Write a protein that binds this ligand. Structure first.
Ligand code: HEM
Ligand code: HEM
Ligand code: HEM
Ligand code: HEM
Ligand SMILES: c1ccc(-c2ccc(Cn3ccnc3)cc2)cc1
Ligand SMILES: c1ccc(-c2ccc(Cn3ccnc3)cc2)cc1
Ligand SMILES: c1ccc(-c2ccc(Cn3ccnc3)cc2)cc1
Lengths: 451, 452, 451, 456
């Protein structure tokens, strides 16, 4: 039982100076070459244990799922200040949400239908653009947001509805925090980071208006409600409950954060498909063969479209939008691969390192739907595929998201083809911002009706 | 109420008190809470309590009267002996103390800091002539002049303003880069228990790091061969002496540059004020006259004979309020404070902005007013609410070097120049472009016209 | 979410002054009347949560088995001083022992055979006493000890073998620690107790000799031994063998502590049977009807003797030899009957209060085999019967001990009858020492050969 | 650099228990010391305790790092989750107050010295009533020292046969025993819990409520009579503090208990003292002669006499040094990560300051194991300090009773020998001063002695 090996940390800086000018991801890869799949790295004076590769990450998040399932200190209540009670009530709330979330996919109106409706409204908008050159960011935030809106408030919004615009602004609107390296070293010496959520005034711009809107919908909802026949999330909340309107803000927030990842995946997907017209075609042909140019694509179609499915896996794999996964905390002294990780140690499951694992993918860095296709061109599981993560806290939205990706993706290409000022050979898929995320470069595209 | 915890607004699950902030910023938000709950109250960031200290009296009772209890660092800076053993822990203690002590030699002592500043002051005057009265942004200039003081002290000699090592080092330490967030991401961070932002996530930083590091290696060498006690030529060979790992120097340099940046920004703010108040620039120009003539360069001993220029610099620091929430600390033991109890390890914000604007100590908290530091006979007077370097066990290690830079740079500049800008006094706006945890002065233009 | 209610503690003394002249057990009962089945009591400045009644003890030890399974601070390794490693190894050792113990019960000779053999050697000894008045303490320690010797060393000892006498002395020989109330108050104020194991010099009297004997047996064992013929625990140890001998000393220690309880249960059992001769008769008659006076009793007989079984249950229930159970520790913040018990809080499962639960026994305080018999005089389960405790840490020896109690009790009474200077009406079953235990009064008894 | 203190490798469950001698814990610790040095780590169960040996180590810990080594054990630590803070600070204020009230000097209704002097006279009288018979002085010594506390607390001394006083002697001083076996002890270690805890013995409650009641009445009677500024004793000091303002009468029980625990050690010191003096008649004589030269046979000894009697003083020091009644000191707890002699002791580590090892430090006493008044006397026969002398411990928690106790030892000891001489059946060569058990205590063997009136 030794602790995981790693580079020796400096006082105050930890291993900060052992990062490449080439990025955090490369640095992690370099460390991994040196020390192996489980190594320890120091941020400030704090140890974090870093998991790399499909096998290590799956042994941790799946085989010792419970041990590797803790949250960060920011999310741990102090019973000396708040009592137990909020602790247990949060537990129950979480489980209620974890449960209801599953229910939407099983039911039952249905999520597939709401997404189909939304895809229709989308195709219509794309015609209105009459093949002009656009940035799809806003459009893709809109179509994925509405799926949440329909599920929570019961009904989708209109793309130009000023509440829906205000809520797109609250949740998706960037703001930035300015730092310098001298300040960062002083933060490390302090023990405290300068930035924390809500330090930017912008956040509050739209908050109260959104809050108020929620109040109204809870009321309009309460007026008409009948268990055990709950319509949307709002009136499920009312039953469970039977101040707190803020529980809804919180849940909506969580769902929008996943939705942002969903929207960015589509936006990245369409960048890839500009770069690879031949793939756009085989997808157009598989839609022809399976759906025709008549009906809208449906979820049952996916099973009969292994090439479109492989293509979407591959879009999520290279898009790698959450490259360090979400850090967790170990809940107890844990034996792992011949080392010991002490209770409460912070862990990074580096998902990027699975999604690019050379033991699981033939060309880890090259678009290759063949990663998900067998000899007979059927869909095959690949164990390195884990963009929603794994185990006890696997993405709550996996199903909603995978479903949005399929319907929006085929429905768009069934009705349109794409083009841009940039020649395939010259599309650059490398992330503009590569810190803790992999945000796709912004680009222009034109949606031309196949009709 | 035997021993209660400090009162505060009720927190929401996950968000804490995040929705209890104003569209008008944290500082207002805090002041509002203060009105409601008093000088010591509890606020929740995520699920974590932080106890907030407001007003001169509370802040002084904590940081001074219970200095030790209020002296801890945040968790990021606490070593885990399970991972690293004790030893590094005690070594850092010793290193910190050595550095704390070394800070005073500048204080009491081959050539002096005051001298080093005067020399820098001269080079500056020269540079300003070269401007020839053109409009310029003084950011870079002020970073340069204050940075050099640290360079002279550490490497033994100042740099040339266009020396490409010094430009590279200005870039490492002072160059802004930004981290992009959204509100939905932030609420997900709170839910996670972890922040996305942490030092070094921006790739920019490494741009100049290795080059700076190598340069340090070289100076440690050139130092090691020539050097010998007890003739500590500068900080580099003070480090060699103690030592008989270069990265220890990078760390110390880093710390001094962070305080320097605040020093430079204070000057930059100071001059914006002085554009807005020409009448004060004049009384300062006049005081320098009685005191110093127009030929010799100002010296530190002049400060005691210039209460109006002193008071004016206090007042620049007060309103500049560049570290409004102080530096968060941690309580080292269960502590009784003003009728409440703060548990061991609780995080604490000493809100220095609230002492610097304390109505009980400053007649016009929000208005430039040298009278705040002057008595009836226009002599300098202590004001208790004045605490921009903080107080107590961890008072700014640079307080001396900084106060000294501010005096020599401000008087030496005004002795040789006068200032002007496209913007009419009435229209200069001193409100911080962005605050965040900072109160950053709006960028502006200014002209330095040689006096003759 | 409130903590369990209880009496207000004084500084330093805690609730010490809230105890009766009438004893700890009654004091708690008075407290239970006042506060309910779950209450908080202070020893020194430390809270301990006390569980009373069959329902609460079963809801904690069984329904939340894991949460209520922790050990006291004295048994918790500090990884700062010893690393993890010893921690995990002890976990593995414990489970290996937990396992082999169950296996042996299932099993060149069965455990039951070894107890049968020992019952024979006992019967013989009782004849050599030729009906003389004796104190059976030593005899009952001997017969139960040998069962452990045979299992660990492979073969039983001779009752006068001087190794075995030395062994009996180490493990079972009383020594005492002297205290005053003024010293005790000073200990509480100190935060430290004076007593700790091994402060009495007497312990070492026989330790090295015993240790050496173990060495020898490990050797004599290592020479001969081989699967698929493990002869006993010693060579099981050798086999899992794949600083060292002392692991046997430790296990032997543990087994002798439960053995002592077993021996004391027989000794208490025979006291009861002096007091209720008719009961001894019905037992003699059920042995007649079922075993006869020819063969030795066997374990399969027990199923066919519900009266003797019910009478042994009742002996264990009233004997109440471990009335506070063994304190445990709570492993996490726990919800329990409307309260919260914080992580690490010490917990007393007060077994005596189950064994005397008026909700489960008609006459809690009166010998009554009817507690375990139905209308047709068949054996019936009683939920308040838990003298081995319950749940994840139920007595490791439950099976060996129940089997010793049956064969030794029937085998003795099949061959002897009992008598004493004291008239039934005058036998007093109240414990001479009512500390944290319930030690039966010492007495004299004669065994007489039956005919 | 900063490694933990060295020690013997512990076994699972048992810790270092098998590394103890048949020869007792103290010898076991001395053997480890030889092997590992003055600071070493030993394991009780799975719990590390750092052991401090020698005058120098114990003084560097309790004195030079006084605060760091001043913690109490877990039993005495409040969990604020259950009790809040408040009881915690109250206790602090309470400790400090008590500490303060005790620091009044020996002479100032009337002084402690006076009370002791009075008590010595009632003692002398009792020893005459024995008319030189052979007695066991245990009860007598508990009585005389107990009374000092009674006088201080209740305002007046008790009569040696007063049935309240006999009941209180019984509550506080009466032994009871807890029976254990080694197999049970190994199981306790495995459990994580000890069977023994204060109050498991029913005997304690025999006299508790009667004592409590007595305290009630006294408080009331006191309440009736207070004329501060004319405060007679501790009872109305307590009442007075409360007045500025259960915990009510219970705080007194608790304090009384604490004082009787130190009193027991004071009484056992005298009892051990007189056993030594049977063994060394020539020392009894030089003491008798120094009492002659200094006090004469006419007045009662007074405290001011001690300064003028360096031989009696040295003899009493030596009685306390070899008596060694608290050989392991009182275990403490380290309040913070602490650098000590090149090692680190982590926050909350339990510490044994082994006072026996200072009291017998060959570096400070020429003949550590032999009675030798010379340890405290210089060349001219004047008293000299010895650094290894620390039977009340040192530092922030030095015995609260040091003054009262040293004063009782001087007045009782001189007064007795001014008025009596001593004898016993056993010849001095044959007196055996080795303590009966060796387990955290060094109880002197019981013995008989005769007190023979001197008759000037
Ligand atoms: C579009 C692709 C998406 C990806 C790749 C993704 C990925 C993830 C990942 C990596 C996690 C962290 C799992 C862990 O902690 O181990 C996560 C958590 C979560 N995601 Fe998603 N997400 C996506 C979309 C969504 C959507 C649409 C939702 C809608 C609700 C969503 C809701 C959540 C929630 C509530 C969690 C919290 C998991 C927990 O800690 O229990 N995500 N997601
Ligand atoms: C106007 C200029 C400066 C201001 C207003 C300023 C203010 C402060 C403040 C408020 C603190 C935190 C006090 C606390 O935690 O209680 C601090 C800490 C510190 N400052 Fe400055 N500082 C300034 C310049 C400098 C300079 C030039 C240096 C260069 C040597 C410097 C070095 C430090 C150091 C080393 C600390 C750490 C103190 C500690 O934690 O013990 N500061 N400063
Ligand atoms: C009538 C005889 C016995 C009784 C009534 C008895 C009762 C108990 C009880 C009440 C416990 C406490 C369980 C807990 O922690 O909740 C216990 C534990 C234990 N007993 Fe027995 N016992 C008896 C005989 C034995 C015997 C013969 C053995 C021989 C191996 C034995 C070995 C153990 C062991 C190893 C444990 C520890 C269980 C654990 O914590 O994992 N006991 N016993
Ligand atoms: C020869 C007689 C005595 C000896 C040798 C003695 C020795 C000691 C020792 C070794 C300690 C432990 C200090 C520590 O924790 O480090 C102590 C503490 C104490 N003694 Fe005594 N003591 C004696 C008599 C008394 C008497 C007569 C009293 C009566 C009031 C008394 C009251 C106390 C108290 C209250 C403490 C607690 C100190 C604290 O931890 O705050 N002692 N004594
Ligand atoms: C990401 C990684 C580590 C951390 C961290 C925070 C506090 C202490 C240690 C590590 C935060 C974000
Ligand atoms: C700056 C950095 C961290 C924090 C913080 C607050 C609460 C809990 C953990 C960290 C506050 C300010
Ligand atoms: C038995 C032994 C120790 C305890 C105990 C109580 C409080 C604190 C530590 C231990 C309880 C029962």
């Amino acid at each position: 039982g030794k602790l995981p090996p790693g580079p020796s940390p400096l006082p105050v800086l930890g291993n900060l100076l052992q990062m490449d000018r080439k990025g955090l991801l490369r640095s992690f890869l370099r460390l991994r070459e040196k020390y192996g799949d489980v190594f320890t790295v120091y941020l400030g004076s704090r140890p974090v244990v870093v998991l790399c590769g499909t096998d290590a990450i799956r042994e941790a998040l799946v085989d010792q799922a419970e041990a590797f399932s803790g949250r960060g200190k920011i999310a741990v209540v102090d019973p000396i200040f708040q009592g137990y009670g909020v602790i247990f009530a949060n537990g129950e709330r979480w489980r209620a949400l974890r449960r209801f979330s599953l229910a939407t996919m099983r039911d039952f109106r249905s999520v597939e239908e709401r997404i189909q409706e939304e895809a229709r409204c989308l195709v219509e908008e794309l015609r209105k653009s009459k093949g002009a050159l656009l940035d799809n960011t806003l459009l893709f935030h809109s179509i994925t947001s509405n799926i949440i809106c329909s599920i929570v408030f019961g009904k989708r919004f209109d793309y130009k509805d000023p509440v829906f615009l205000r809520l797109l602004d609250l949740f998706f609107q960037s703001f930035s925090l300015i730092s310098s390296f001298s300040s960062q070293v002083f933060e490390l010496f302090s023990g405290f980071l300068k930035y924390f959520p809500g330090t930017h005034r912008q956040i509050y711009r739209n908050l109260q208006e959104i809050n108020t809107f929620i109040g109204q919908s809870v009321e309009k909802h309460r007026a008409t409600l009948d268990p055990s026949n709950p319509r949307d999330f709002i009136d499920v909340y009312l039953l469970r409950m039977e101040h707190h309107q803020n529980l809804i803000l919180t849940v909506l927030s969580l769902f929008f954060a996943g939705t942002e990842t969903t929207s960015t995946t589509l936006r990245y997907g369409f960048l890839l498909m500009l770069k690879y017209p031949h793939v756009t075609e085989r997808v157009q042909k598989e839609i022809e063969q399976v759906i025709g140019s008549h009906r809208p694509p449906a979820l049952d179609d996916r099973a009969k479209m292994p090439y479109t499915d492989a293509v979407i896996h591959e879009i999520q794999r290279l898009g790698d939008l959450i490259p360090f996964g979400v850090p967790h905390t170990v809940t107890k002294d844990t034996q792992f691969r011949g080392y010991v990780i002490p209770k409460n140690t912070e862990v990074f499951p580096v998902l990027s390192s699975a999604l690019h694992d050379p033991r699981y993918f033939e060309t880890p860095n090259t678009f290759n739907p063949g990663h998900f296709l067998d000899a007979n061109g059927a869909l095959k599981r690949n164990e390195g595929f884990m963009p929603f993560s794994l185990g006890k806290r696997i993405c709550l939205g996996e199903g909603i998201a995978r479903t949005e990706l399929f319907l929006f993706f085929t429905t768009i290409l069934q009705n349109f083809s794409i083009a841009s000022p940039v020649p395939p050979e010259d599309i650059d898929l490398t992330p503009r911002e590569s810190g803790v995320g992999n945000v796709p470069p912004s680009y222009q595209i034109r949606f031309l009706a196949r009709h």
